[PDB]
Design an enzyme around this catalytic site. Sequence first.
Site, short mmCIF file in Angstrom:
data_model
loop_
_atom_site.label_atom_id
_atom_site.label_comp_id
_atom_site.label_asym_id
_atom_site.label_seq_id
_atom_site.Cartn_x
_atom_site.Cartn_y
_atom_site.Cartn_z
N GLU A 8 0.94 -1.13 0.00
CA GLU A 8 0.00 0.00 0.00
C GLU A 8 0.97 1.17 0.00
O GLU A 8 1.15 1.88 0.99
CB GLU A 8 -0.93 0.06 1.22
CG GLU A 8 -1.96 1.18 1.01
CD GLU A 8 -3.01 1.33 2.10
OE1 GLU A 8 -3.46 2.48 2.30
OE2 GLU A 8 -3.39 0.33 2.73
N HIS A 10 1.89 4.41 -2.35
CA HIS A 10 1.34 5.26 -3.40
C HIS A 10 2.23 6.24 -4.14
O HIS A 10 3.29 6.64 -3.67
CB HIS A 10 0.17 6.04 -2.81
CG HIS A 10 -0.79 5.20 -2.03
ND1 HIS A 10 -1.68 4.33 -2.63
CD2 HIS A 10 -1.02 5.12 -0.70
CE1 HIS A 10 -2.41 3.75 -1.70
NE2 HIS A 10 -2.04 4.21 -0.52
N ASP A 284 1.84 2.56 3.66
CA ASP A 284 0.95 3.65 3.26
C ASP A 284 1.80 4.87 2.91
O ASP A 284 1.34 6.01 3.00
CB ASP A 284 -0.06 4.01 4.37
CG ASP A 284 -1.37 4.54 3.82
OD1 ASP A 284 -1.51 4.66 2.58
OD2 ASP A 284 -2.28 4.83 4.62
O1 LIG Z 1 -3.87 6.37 1.28
C1 LIG Z 1 -3.73 7.06 2.33
C2 LIG Z 1 -4.17 8.42 2.36
C3 LIG Z 1 -4.78 8.96 1.18
C4 LIG Z 1 -5.24 10.33 1.15
C5 LIG Z 1 -5.08 11.12 2.31
C6 LIG Z 1 -4.48 10.60 3.47
O2 LIG Z 1 -4.35 11.38 4.55
C7 LIG Z 1 -4.02 9.23 3.51
O3 LIG Z 1 -3.46 8.79 4.67
ZN LIG Z 2 -3.25 4.30 1.26
#
Ligand SMILES: O=Cc1cccc(O)c1O
Ligand SMILES: [Zn+2]
Lengths: 321, 323, 324, 325
Positions: A8, A10, A284
């Site tokens: 996960e 991004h 994340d």
């Molecule tokens: O994917 C995680 C995520 C996406 C948009 C905003 C945010 O704060 C996030 O932690």
């Molecule tokens: Zn995420």
Amino acid sequence: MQGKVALEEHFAIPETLQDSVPGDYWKELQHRLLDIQDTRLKLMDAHGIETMILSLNAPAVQAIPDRRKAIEIARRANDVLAEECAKRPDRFLAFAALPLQDPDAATEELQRCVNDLGFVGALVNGFSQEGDGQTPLYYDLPQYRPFWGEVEKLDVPFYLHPRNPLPQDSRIYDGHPWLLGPTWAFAQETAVHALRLMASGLFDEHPRLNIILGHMGEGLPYMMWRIDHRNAWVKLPPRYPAKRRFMDYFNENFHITTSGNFRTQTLIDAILEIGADRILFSTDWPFENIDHASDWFNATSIAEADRVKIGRTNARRLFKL
Amino acid sequence: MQGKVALEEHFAIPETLQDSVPGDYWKELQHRLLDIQDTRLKLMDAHGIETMILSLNAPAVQAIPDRRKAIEIARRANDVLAEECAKRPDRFLAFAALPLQDPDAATEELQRCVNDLGFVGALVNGFSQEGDGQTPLYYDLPQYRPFWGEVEKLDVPFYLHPRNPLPQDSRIYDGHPWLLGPTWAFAQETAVHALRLMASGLFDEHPRLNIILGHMGEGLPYMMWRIDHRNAWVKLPPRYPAKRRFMDYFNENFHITTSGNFRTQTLIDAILEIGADRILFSTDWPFENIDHASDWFNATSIAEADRVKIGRTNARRLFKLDG
Amino acid sequence: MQGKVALEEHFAIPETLQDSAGFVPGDYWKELQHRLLDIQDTRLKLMDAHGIETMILSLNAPAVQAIPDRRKAIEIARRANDVLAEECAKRPDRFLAFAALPLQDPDAATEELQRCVNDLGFVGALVNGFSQEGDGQTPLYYDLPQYRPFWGEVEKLDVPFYLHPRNPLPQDSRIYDGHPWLLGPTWAFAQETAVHALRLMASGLFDEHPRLNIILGHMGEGLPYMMWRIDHRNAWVKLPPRYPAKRRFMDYFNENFHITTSGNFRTQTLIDAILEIGADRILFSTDWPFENIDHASDWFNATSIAEADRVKIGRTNARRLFKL
Amino acid sequence: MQGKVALEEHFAIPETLQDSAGFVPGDYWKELQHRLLDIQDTRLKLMDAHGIETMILSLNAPAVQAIPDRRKAIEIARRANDVLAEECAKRPDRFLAFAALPLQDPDAATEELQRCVNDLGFVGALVNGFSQEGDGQTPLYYDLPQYRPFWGEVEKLDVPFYLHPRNPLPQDSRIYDGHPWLLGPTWAFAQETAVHALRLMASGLFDEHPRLNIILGHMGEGLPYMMWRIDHRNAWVKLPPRYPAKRRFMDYFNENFHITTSGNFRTQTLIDAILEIGADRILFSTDWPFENIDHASDWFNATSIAEADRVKIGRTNARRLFKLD
Ligand SMILES: O=Cc1cccc(O)c1O
Ligand SMILES: [Zn+2]
Ligand SMILES: O=Cc1cccc(O)c1O
Ligand SMILES: O=Cc1cccc(O)c1O
Ligand SMILES: O=Cc1cccc(O)c1O
Ligand SMILES: [Zn+2]
Ligand SMILES: [Zn+2]
Ligand SMILES: [Zn+2]
């Protein structure tokens, strides 16, 4: 721990960059989202991450009402992702972005990503918006069954990522914008969407499907017993179309990741509910620091055998690496 | 274990009975809700429950949009409850039903119940409806501050119980009625209401408040770390009115019960998050069987010292039953 | 749960029956004897009623390990193994066997293991701690040099070795003087077995034979809870351990050991073990006839773990370990 | 966490220093000696840097319990207690003390305990397992009849008794022959102490003196993990146990014992203990100087428990037990 897999993680293209307070933090987050080969790779090297399965940010495609533009942006994001992975194919894998506001177009793009680009799955930010975009489209609906049939055919996982609910479906948060996003709204939105898929009977029809949830299951493990067993004295079969219990589909068709939920107590509960074989390490990034995720995971209170599975082998097995 | 205290134990009156699939099950539930001195007491005697703190069913008063009517039904329900507890004061205690769609009326009814009827707290089924009843009224709103000041003054706990959201606020559940109620909707609705109270700064203004949540905290313990710590690398302060973190208020002003959540794993997680000193036994009868709750709790995997605290002494202390 | 595998399930032959006499009140001796001698009747009915498909049988304790005369020890071991093979053959779809070994004679034990595995189809060995030989006044532990050839053969045959408990000799039991209630399963069994296990690890046995699989019952005889301390006590001292082994106790425990739930039906204990050695290395077992099969099964069916792990601990871990 | 209380913190006097020599390599001996003799300097600086407000001090091991001559034992115990009282007086706001006792002489031990508590203000006693007396070839356990009067006085004074480890005598250590690395904190210490504790329980001591408070370090010396089995092994046999105590081992462990985190900085172990004996009976401790204070504090500050329990285990359980409020 070395040789970990994170899934996960991004990135963004200029078109979706705005989807994610002015200042140094926003500037830094933008840099992180656009970077793949520099900062990101160096952190992977310093924090024992061998494999990073990349995905577009949120809500991205799911927030584009015009199916025409949605298809275009998805294709664009996927081609860029393919180009980035090719630079270090030994380190980067990819999840496809899909224009689900158009079932057939989504099915076609997934096939292209998997068959031609070598993508190992799909990541979607909750419900889709289409047309006037004032109606949340959930994937348990009839028009998506053909799509799920193809997902099962390609035999690749579907990562159900969070997104915020539409304003008209967020009154409970009115006056409390701080409850939207990762604080809470994200989890509720995703947990229910997951439950809808289960209740619909989707997994009875396509039992080989593999769904992945981040943030340690969006709260599901802790309440799973209650979800099925509430009012147990009432011995009447459940009303939903699914043939079995929620716990059955959660235990057989789902996997959860540690993204943005670096809490040992939470991990222990999950280990005693879904089992270590179905928990995967993830961070994340760039919304969470990689060092934060890795340092926590390297020392969390679990068996070393399970640290190896959760940090690496579960994912390598799931993605046939 | 004998001598237990249970505090999410419901009853109904004809006027609210309907708030709670024809057949033998519906008939049985009705009998249970209307019974207090017979079936209920026999089960308490068979399953080691000495004290039962009673409360009206849901949504009850919170679903009565007309102020005058809500005030009437609450007052009626409280008088009925007072009379039932008086028959066996050594076994039954009471939580007040409140007409919160009218802040001042609710404050007076709580005072009436606590000071004149000897009630030990209040149980409210989430947000209130008023007027056209199309707007959910949460208790973090400014108009309820005087009320909370009184709750703190009287020094009695406030049990924030579930209720379903209004249809216009439940589209995510459209087509899935099975997700409403205790299956899930109840938890989301209550957990968020609790967080609203926290974020509003209510506990900075009235730090001695004691809020009780059933169903093991409506999911909060498992995600509490994330609630405050998500995106930790961003060292910018939260912009809510509250002066501290959610975990601070949850850890200092909240207590959770085992109602309708007889799961050992869940209890262990809670023990490692909020601590055994803030967990209380409860069943959610008549919606849950008392034997189911008691048999599970008597054997759950915790220290015997904690079984005593969670099953009895935490509640005795919280409601000042030892003096 | 149905289809479970249990592997600390005992039986006795007339020659070893009396060894179990001093482990239960006289009022229960008749019943215990019946249980120990019964394999095809009551035992099978209990297995059917409590979801146990496979039972890996083993002789009682201390049995062979308490026979000082080598010739006699070899004799009783062979007889006990022949009887076990005969009983398993009557119901091969439900019973498997662990070999009894005359380890007071290393060479003879090595030969008997080969016979049991190669000719009788046994799937491992179960030994009740140290052996007695000659005057029988000295406990013989298996980390000693003379047993290395034996361990080499165990690794070659590639079958697990179940290190079962036994009480220490009187001269080595003074700490329990005046407290006979501390001997046996109450406590003495665990201390005796845990230390024997540590001796094997510290000796470097697993550096020499890394593929060995050792099994311990009673949830590891206490090892999981104290494993961190065993290696990390006085951590500020940055010097290598003084024992022959090249690595840490936790390395050998994590890589060469498996533990069973025999006679330790405690959820808290299981959770700790899961968080220390992992569900993949924990196996269901009962310790019948010293423990009731229904007690073990009812507890395990409802213990607080993931259903996926209940299947592994109750069945698949053992089927994988014994190549079933 | 600041304001912690630690209670398995040792020191030594010249007369007992050599007792600690064999538990650290030759290279670290110089450092260990400095640590054992230091109380006002290094030790205090570490307490200030690692949030420890109160340190209840105790002599090293086996010390007094390994002196078979009653007269010498009484002399050394008294000398060690006087030195400790002198040291605590230098900073009474930071140091408290456990009495060393010459238990090879029951009456003398009872009198010294009274002197330490009533005149020196000591808050309890710390004893390194069994005593040796006379020829010193027989381990003397405290469940024996001659110690009942002593226990009665301990209960009367109402101060805790910390049952600390020691190694068994050589003739009672054959299971460790050839494996000296298994003696001490690696394992032997735990076995020796766990069984001594069980002997006290089985003896009925806590039926006779139910208000006694016994403390064990190293997270209970392994007891919590096996406690269920200790009482429930062979449960199908429906006959009462044969020991003199009226109840179960778990009853006495749950009601008369407290365990500390000394030398056992393991979260999994702490979780098991919380689910067996409860957070109200677990106390923070380090085992300094045998363990680094920062190792203990850093682990405890981050272990996976409720913050409310971190405060209890780190400070308030101890303050309640030793009546410091
Ligand atoms: O994917 C995680 C995520 C996406 C948009 C905003 C945010 O704060 C996030 O932690
Ligand atoms: Zn995420
Ligand atoms: O309070 C519990 C409850 C109330 C209404 C309906 C229901 O199913 C419940 O479990
Ligand atoms: O094998 C188990 C066993 C053997 C002898 C005695 C006893 O009590 C036992 O539990
Ligand atoms: O008290 C702890 C202790 C005492 C003597 C020796 C040793 O190694 C220790 O860890
Ligand atoms: Zn309720
Ligand atoms: Zn056995
Ligand atoms: Zn010590």
